[PDB]
Ligand binder design. Sequence first.
Ligand code: AGS
Ligand code: ADP
Ligand code: ADP
Ligand code: MG
Lengths: 567, 561
Amino acid sequence: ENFTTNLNQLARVGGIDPLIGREKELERAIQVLCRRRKNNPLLVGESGVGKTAIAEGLAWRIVQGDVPEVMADCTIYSLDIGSLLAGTKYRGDFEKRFKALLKQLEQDTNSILFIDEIHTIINLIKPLLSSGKIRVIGSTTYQEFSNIFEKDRALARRFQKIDITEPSIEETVQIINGLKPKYEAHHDVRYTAKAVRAAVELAVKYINDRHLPDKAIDVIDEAGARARLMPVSKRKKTVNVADIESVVARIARIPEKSVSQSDRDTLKNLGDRLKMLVFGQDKAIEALTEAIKMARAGLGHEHKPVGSFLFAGPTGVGKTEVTVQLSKALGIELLRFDMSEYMERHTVSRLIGAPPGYVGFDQGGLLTDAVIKHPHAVLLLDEIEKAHPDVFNILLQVMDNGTLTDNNGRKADFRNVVLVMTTNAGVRETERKSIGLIHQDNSTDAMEEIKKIFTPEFRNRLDNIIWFDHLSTDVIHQVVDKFIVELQVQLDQKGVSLEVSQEARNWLAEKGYDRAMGARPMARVIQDNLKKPLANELLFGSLVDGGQVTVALDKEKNELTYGFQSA
Amino acid sequence: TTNLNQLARVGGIDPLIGREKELERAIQVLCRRRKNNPLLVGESGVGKTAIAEGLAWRIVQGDVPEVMADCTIYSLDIGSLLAGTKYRGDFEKRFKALLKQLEQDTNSILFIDEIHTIIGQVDAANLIKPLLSSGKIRVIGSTTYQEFSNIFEKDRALARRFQKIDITEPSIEETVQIINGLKPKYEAHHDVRYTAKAVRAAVELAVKYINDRHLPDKAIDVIDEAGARARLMPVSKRKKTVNVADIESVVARIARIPEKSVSQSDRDTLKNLGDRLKMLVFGQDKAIEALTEAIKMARAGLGHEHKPVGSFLFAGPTGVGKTEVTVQLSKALGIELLRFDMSEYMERHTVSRLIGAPPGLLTDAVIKHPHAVLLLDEIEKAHPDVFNILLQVMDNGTLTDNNGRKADFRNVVLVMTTNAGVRETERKSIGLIHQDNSTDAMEEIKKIFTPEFRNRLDNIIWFDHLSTDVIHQVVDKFIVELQVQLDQKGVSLEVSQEARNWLAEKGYDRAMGARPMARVIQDNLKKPLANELLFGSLVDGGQVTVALDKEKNELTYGFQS
Ligand SMILES: Nc1ncnc2c1ncn2[C@@H]1O[C@H](COP(=O)(O)OP(=O)(O)OP(O)(O)=S)[C@@H](O)[C@H]1O
Ligand SMILES: Nc1ncnc2c1ncn2[C@@H]1O[C@H](COP(=O)(O)OP(=O)(O)O)[C@@H](O)[C@H]1O
Ligand SMILES: Nc1ncnc2c1ncn2[C@@H]1O[C@H](COP(=O)(O)OP(=O)(O)O)[C@@H](O)[C@H]1O
Ligand SMILES: [Mg+2]
């Protein structure tokens, strides 16, 4: 009694919440219990799916009487793992306590024991099952079932697998609606029907953390607590959809704008936002917006991925910038996998294999699990030309069916992820000089390179070939100013003030920036040129105090001249 | 047990400052129908207990919501039952009655400090709370992150009833305010007076040199230590004035840092060091210049403060002393040397030792020696998994082992030595006239290492083949090394100028660097002397001079005693 509480008796007095739905799942649980042998139900599931609640809901049904006569008198007791284990801290002392508890249940016929999180415990579990005097309910995670139940033949034979699947979107809101009267009575304030339905959709799309149904129940209670606690509750007797989103911000860790509904609103601002931080190449961003626009409208196959993008040109063509901004604008975690490392059998196995350890089974496919970890996260691929043709074939499979299957058996859905690729074929051909007495430009069309490097089917499945325009000199000058501004703000904290001449910015721009390497060398060029000379003075010299710095160039020698003042 | 609300009126609890974000989140979860019991998990020494007490004080103040007002916070001592109720059966009488007292008052709240002890007499406390509470009784639990995993994950019942709310680290400005509030107690205890400016500097200085503890604990310790230091350490006048100079001695002893490290008067050491390291290693002036330049930049220019002060990669031909630079760098800089051999870390199973306890080292070394030079020799040998640890260490600047303690990598300087550069096209061109061959820059280094990891490295330093002139300088170093060894036996070695040139050219190999130079000197100088020392006049110690004869172009050894 003390070690294990009585759920059936508890439900008779109250506390247990009535279970709505799950009629088919509960029906099967009743069926196995009525069996002469192998009558130990196993509510396999995931955290938050309601498997524990199903046990509590089953106990309520028995007292209510919605069960066969044989099961009407049965009593479900939930074994407390913490109570028995706590206070002993010894091997075999815990078992002695379990023997006494088991004896009490064995003495009383038609007694049901519920071992929540049974995998944690799993010596005495096998004997009670083999005897068959008392049937036992066990809740274990799907991952733990394979690790423990499947490996042990005896445990698997006695326990019957009952598949507990998460309810659909419509089902999840219905569960909240069924349980909404209880909540409203508890705090005396109600939620609008639009708000509860919206909570399910907004929670899963942004938080993506515990469970589809669990997040809905947790998000509704969190919203009511904030609104009721606030003094405005007297004036505000209903919960607005935005109010939940504002409360959801606390458990989101992102601004309210991201949580705010932007299915159609993001389209207009996202186009402007890309241009706000990126100068020029409006056509390139328009191609990206057009492909994702199709998914929001919804006039497409559900399995087909959200969007397909492509990038060409030299390294550092804003692939990281546009992707980071695109991910930020869409409020999706940025996931980037580099094909540059996938050039060997061991490395190429990484997409669907577990390079960290063969013993390790949880990670499985690193690229595949990344999608599973974040359903909406964007996938950024770079230097795909390097990768072997065989690896590229698997990409074609997911693009067609919009789904993948891991070696471990996990299934990943690409219906919610946009796939973008980056290619740098142009730099290799253009830099080469023609083999002739008089040289000729070796620049070639980017589309030509995509066709030769990749198979025709890839282009056919791909919605369109997107070529990003090359960087402009005006942008490079602005980029130089940004780095100086970044360096400038860093110096202001220490108390040093740096002033750079306009001619100095142009001077660094010509030598630093390269056509083949884009803006990558300019970044490095600004660090060594400016940080190194001041660094010596900052430690010891004129810049130790005051921090007065001037930057200028000498036209006669074409070398930068640095002036240091003690100040 | 005691009533914090009544204690607030007495004034025992100091006024809460800051923590608005945590308090706002804490009060809402408390009101929730489910997970009504807040769980204030926090890092060690983060002031989790103190902020919880502050919440009780806020109730009387009325800053909290009107509904929350009148809530009666309570605090129960664990030792009151572990020690007081030695007998069996008395425990149930006290908690059943206590829980009844908590009950009959809806606003009543409890605060069980160190909740990990409560769950894991201990067992009865865990079970008794949920069975009869039925959500009527609300409680607050404080525990460490390490302890939190041991209890929260093992028992799912607590998790459904408890909402984990993290405790943020207070700002330095926030921390100094706490010291001012508690300053009268510390001053009265040691009869010392603390300067307001110096107290603020103590918080800044404490974080700069002490990182194992958190901001509140380290700030409290330095201030309290200063009172004891001023109380007894100054023999002259037993002055009560506490200046930043005095606190420097306090942090100096506590942080195991040398006197004048606080002064920062090491610019001359770094300034002269430009050629001190180059004096010991010849032919790597360009390589060392870049290395020293980066160190100078990192010390003055913080750049990314979160990342380690220095990240370097040494690649080049064999015998160029790439590893030599690392060992000498620690001596010239004066920092301790930490050496790890990745050859032992060849397999994947063994790397678990590198990060934490074995399933069923880097972090431990760093905490023990924050100021150190982590020489990850033969880095290429280890599996790519290690690169992930280095990647996390470089970007985040901290690593967590199985114990979960945080290691400070900002002070330590990470360096590695790779042997990819040894590969060279030794074979000469197929022609009457030989043609120089240049290897592709970092071709092997680029392929072997991942691009993101390589980009994080500040500079992939290279090492050029030792020049013939440079090799001559190395000969002098080995001669001096032989000379000091012979000093113990008593022999004095003199080497002719012409002898040095002959030895240098015979042992000058670009691919092998300076390694063959040791062998030629060993065969030409150490081997003859050994026979003479064991079976000659040199046994008792005598002058020896070596000079080559032009006619036969071979060294001649003369022994005297
Ligand atoms: N450039 C150098 N300057 C001074 N001594 C050197 C130099 N290169 C090698 N040595 C000597 O060689 C020994 C140390 O060599 P190491 O530092 O192990 O060389 P290394 O090139 O790192 O070796 P590998 O390539 O890893 S086998 C000591 O006796 C040094 O004095
Ligand atoms: N289908 C469902 N019907 C009713 N409540 C559900 C359902 N699924 C989940 N819940 C809710 O899940 C909450 C926690 O129970 P459960 O998810 O079984 O816990 P656990 O995650 O520990 O297995 C309960 O408060 C319950 O109301
Ligand atoms: N707002 C505050 N007012 C007063 N003291 C505070 C405040 N915040 C933190 N403290 C201090 O925090 C300390 C409590 O640390 P504690 O939580 O017991 O550490 P640990 O978790 O390592 O055992 C005390 O010195 C206390 O005075
Ligand atoms: Mg070496």
